[PDB]
Design an enzyme around this catalytic site. Structure first.
Site, PDB file in Angstrom:
ATOM      1  N   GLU A  58       0.831  -1.202   0.000  1.00 36.75           N
ATOM      2  CA  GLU A  58       0.000   0.000   0.000  1.00 36.75           C
ATOM      3  C   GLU A  58       0.870   1.258   0.000  1.00 36.75           C
ATOM      4  O   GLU A  58       0.544   2.242  -0.671  1.00 36.75           O
ATOM      5  CB  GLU A  58      -0.973   0.040   1.174  1.00 36.75           C
ATOM      6  CG  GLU A  58      -1.979   1.192   1.096  1.00 36.75           C
ATOM      7  CD  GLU A  58      -2.671   1.461   2.438  1.00 36.75           C
ATOM      8  OE1 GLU A  58      -3.874   1.808   2.437  1.00 36.75           O
ATOM      9  OE2 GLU A  58      -2.009   1.311   3.493  1.00 36.75           O
ATOM     10  N   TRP A  80      -8.276  -1.975  -0.742  1.00 38.11           N
ATOM     11  CA  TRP A  80      -8.945  -0.804  -1.300  1.00 38.11           C
ATOM     12  C   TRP A  80     -10.021  -1.164  -2.322  1.00 38.11           C
ATOM     13  O   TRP A  80     -10.688  -0.280  -2.868  1.00 38.11           O
ATOM     14  CB  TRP A  80      -7.917   0.175  -1.897  1.00 38.11           C
ATOM     15  CG  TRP A  80      -7.294   1.080  -0.845  1.00 38.11           C
ATOM     16  CD1 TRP A  80      -5.982   1.091  -0.419  1.00 38.11           C
ATOM     17  CD2 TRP A  80      -7.971   2.078  -0.062  1.00 38.11           C
ATOM     18  NE1 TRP A  80      -5.813   2.042   0.565  1.00 38.11           N
ATOM     19  CE2 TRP A  80      -7.018   2.657   0.801  1.00 38.11           C
ATOM     20  CE3 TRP A  80      -9.291   2.535  -0.015  1.00 38.11           C
ATOM     21  CZ2 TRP A  80      -7.349   3.668   1.702  1.00 38.11           C
ATOM     22  CZ3 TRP A  80      -9.613   3.535   0.869  1.00 38.11           C
ATOM     23  CH2 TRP A  80      -8.649   4.097   1.716  1.00 38.11           C
ATOM     24  N   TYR A  94      -4.555   9.746  -1.387  1.00 33.24           N
ATOM     25  CA  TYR A  94      -3.253   9.890  -0.758  1.00 33.24           C
ATOM     26  C   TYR A  94      -2.067  10.093  -1.717  1.00 33.24           C
ATOM     27  O   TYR A  94      -1.444  11.142  -1.724  1.00 33.24           O
ATOM     28  CB  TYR A  94      -2.974   8.684   0.139  1.00 33.24           C
ATOM     29  CG  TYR A  94      -3.987   8.418   1.235  1.00 33.24           C
ATOM     30  CD1 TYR A  94      -3.935   9.111   2.439  1.00 33.24           C
ATOM     31  CD2 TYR A  94      -4.947   7.434   1.091  1.00 33.24           C
ATOM     32  CE1 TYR A  94      -4.826   8.844   3.463  1.00 33.24           C
ATOM     33  CE2 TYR A  94      -5.839   7.161   2.096  1.00 33.24           C
ATOM     34  CZ  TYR A  94      -5.773   7.864   3.284  1.00 33.24           C
ATOM     35  OH  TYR A  94      -6.668   7.591   4.281  1.00 33.24           O
ATOM     36  N   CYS A 146      -7.714   9.545   5.832  1.00 32.02           N
ATOM     37  CA  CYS A 146      -7.782   9.380   7.281  1.00 32.02           C
ATOM     38  C   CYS A 146      -6.467   9.875   7.873  1.00 32.02           C
ATOM     39  O   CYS A 146      -6.463  10.680   8.807  1.00 32.02           O
ATOM     40  CB  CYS A 146      -8.042   7.920   7.689  1.00 32.02           C
ATOM     41  SG  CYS A 146      -9.535   7.178   7.013  1.00 32.02           S
ATOM     42  N   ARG A 166      -7.126  12.053  11.310  1.00 29.93           N
ATOM     43  CA  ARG A 166      -8.378  12.676  11.729  1.00 29.93           C
ATOM     44  C   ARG A 166      -9.426  11.646  12.154  1.00 29.93           C
ATOM     45  O   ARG A 166     -10.353  11.954  12.901  1.00 29.93           O
ATOM     46  CB  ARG A 166      -8.949  13.526  10.590  1.00 29.93           C
ATOM     47  CG  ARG A 166      -9.129  12.722   9.324  1.00 29.93           C
ATOM     48  CD  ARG A 166     -10.361  13.111   8.558  1.00 29.93           C
ATOM     49  NE  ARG A 166     -10.670  12.123   7.530  1.00 29.93           N
ATOM     50  CZ  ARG A 166     -11.735  11.323   7.534  1.00 29.93           C
ATOM     51  NH1 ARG A 166     -12.641  11.415   8.514  1.00 29.93           N
ATOM     52  NH2 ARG A 166     -11.900  10.450   6.543  1.00 29.93           N
ATOM     53  N   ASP A 169      -9.870   4.052  12.804  1.00 30.12           N
ATOM     54  CA  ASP A 169     -10.491   2.758  13.118  1.00 30.12           C
ATOM     55  C   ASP A 169      -9.417   1.932  13.846  1.00 30.12           C
ATOM     56  O   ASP A 169      -8.533   1.383  13.215  1.00 30.12           O
ATOM     57  CB  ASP A 169     -10.988   2.073  11.830  1.00 30.12           C
ATOM     58  CG  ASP A 169     -11.486   0.632  12.060  1.00 30.12           C
ATOM     59  OD1 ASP A 169     -11.192   0.042  13.106  1.00 30.12           O
ATOM     60  OD2 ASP A 169     -12.162   0.085  11.177  1.00 30.12           O
TER      61      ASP A 169
END
Ligand SMILES: Cc1nc(=O)c2cc(CN(C)c3ccc(C(=O)N[C@@H](CCC(=O)O)C(=O)O)s3)ccc2[nH]1
Ligand SMILES: Cc1nc(=O)c2cc(CN(C)c3ccc(C(=O)N[C@@H](CCC(=O)O)C(=O)O)s3)ccc2[nH]1
Ligand SMILES: O=c1ccn([C@H]2C[C@H](O)[C@@H](COP(=O)(O)O)O2)c(=O)[nH]1
Ligand SMILES: O=c1ccn([C@H]2C[C@H](O)[C@@H](COP(=O)(O)O)O2)c(=O)[nH]1
Lengths: 261, 261
Positions: A58, A80, A94, A146, A166, A169
């Protein structure tokens, strides 16, 4: 030292119940922080077996600046897949922002090269920042970032990295995020001629999903083990690292804990 | 509860000596946090007299979306004069990004209104963010944004705010920054029919300037007094607040400590 388990436990115990976008429900705290001394060990969790392969790919994917899952898919990584269109697109997420943030002038700004360039020529700079939070492009992304914004710091030849996440999980995403950014810090340090310092994780909305409570309690019942050690092969450029240039030595985790369906 | 003075003491005692852009020299730590419970009191420091008027007009000035020191100058506030052009222009700094971030579509985004909207109609959102860190426009700015990025969070009808401050002059800047964000949090709370919660200050490079050491010691030698109370007059819009609407009750600080030459 178990910053992550400490935080997970804290949120499980004192988190506020709270509804959310997914409709799943969460317990939640705001503005919580973790610190890892990366010189002490690579923070790939040992209380459950974390799928590092997917973390590494990733990150390499981000570093390529791809918006399409194709390449991730070819290396067997499906994290994803849900969020992609049928052509594979995720929007300017990103990696697109890291590598080619569109300025109004029509220039694309490579923040990763810029950051590395600052680590090499002006390490005392208070502006070594990468942001994926492109206010103007959020709406075209499949999910807003995130892990939104990160800053590097140098002290006595040692590189520290702080990330503002921000939305966190805690069971699912956070273990990936920690390893991802620790890996990134190693790569950046290697390319800048520095050694690793601290990784500081600063979170906004830090949540445990209501359907992960059992998985979490099981994980908290396990005794942590020695962190593994990260090694990297030599490369000319951060953009030239491959999966095979990375080794995780002495990783000895407790069994994997499957995410609920 | 003195998170500011504790942090001040902590950098003074354990921060690492470090060169910087201004040439002054600092002592510095990375990734430090302060938390204030805004329901307990308004965090206008009492260990020295803080010019709140400058603080409030600066905030109102941001909210206006202004890039020109003009409106500020007219109100007897001079903190940005030194950085302004001959025309008094600072480029696209805080206020311009807050109220009118340029999207590649040509649209201009009022982040302040968008955050308020979320606080009112979707207070559980984990996406209630305002960012001044516009990568594509930094070079046009007199100074890159110090208080760079902030997020709101709601629990039990209580509004919290976390600020990411990439760079923090602990003696001079941070006392303003703390008051300013605490103030904005009150405004957002009132406008969304919420009460106030926590202000979380998260810093990147947190430093004491070499020329501030003697002043810092003076401040640390003084015993804190009760925090004052913020009293905000009613308005039907955040953009309609005036200085007159903003009252600070029972502020009883030690004498001001001037910023050395
Ligand atoms: C509610 C929510 N939490 C997340 O962590 C999340 C993460 C992504 C993308 N991403 C950042 C992911 C990091 C880890 C993932 C996950 O599937 N973890 C399994 C790994 C299975 C495997 O690949 O072998 C696991 O760790 O149990 S997914 C997209 C939407 C999300 N939505
Ligand atoms: C190295 C550096 N440190 C700073 O704190 C700083 C602050 C601004 C603008 N701003 C964010 C300011 C907040 C407080 C200020 C200061 O001069 N305060 C004096 C009183 C001055 C006044 O009331 O007008 C004081 O606090 O003692 S200035 C621009 C460049 C900087 N550069
Ligand atoms: O790299 C990632 C990507 C997603 N998430 C989680 C956080 C949230 O639970 C969810 C994102 O949904 P929103 O916060 O935008 O509602 O996925 C992470 O923790 N790390
Ligand atoms: O609201 C503000 C504006 C500026 N600064 C300080 C931080 C740095 O000392 C300096 C900016 O210089 P650089 O970090 O960009 O070198 O001004 C603050 O502490 N608060």
């Amino acid at each position: 030292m178990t910053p992550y388990e400490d935080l997970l436990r804290f949120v499980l115990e004192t988190g506020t119940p709270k509804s959310d976008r997914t409709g799943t429900g969460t317990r939640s705290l705001f503005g919580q922080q973790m610190r890892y001394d990366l010189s002490a060990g690579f923070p790939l969790l040992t209380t459950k077996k974390v799928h590092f392969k997917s973390v590494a790919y990733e990150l390499l994917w981000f570093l390529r600046g791809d918006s399409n899952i194709g390449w991730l898919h070819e290396h067997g990584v499906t994290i994803w897949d849900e969020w992609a269109s049928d052509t594979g697109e995720l929007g300017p997420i990103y990696g697109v922002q890291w590598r080619s943030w569109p300025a109004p002038s029509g220039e694309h700004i490579d923040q990763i090269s810029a950051a590395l360039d600052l680590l090499r020529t002006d390490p005392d700079s208070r502006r070594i920042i990468v942001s994926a939070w492109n206010v103007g492009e959020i709406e075209r992304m499949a999910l807003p970032p995130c892990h939104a914004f990160f800053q590097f710091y140098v002290a006595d030849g040692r590189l520290s990295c702080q990330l503002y996440q921000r939305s966190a999980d805690l069971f699912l995403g956070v273990p990936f995020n920690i390893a991802s950014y620790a890996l990134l810090t190693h790569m950046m340090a290697a390319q800048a001629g520095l050694s690793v310092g601290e990784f500081i994780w600063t979170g906004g909305d830090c949540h445990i999903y209501d359907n992960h409570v059992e998985q979490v309690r099981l994980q908290l019942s396990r005794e942590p083990r020695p962190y593994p050690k990260l090694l990297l092969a030599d490369r000319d450029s951060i953009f030239e690292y491959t999966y095979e240039d990375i080794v995780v030595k002495n990783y000895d985790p407790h069994p994997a804990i499957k995410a609920p369906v």
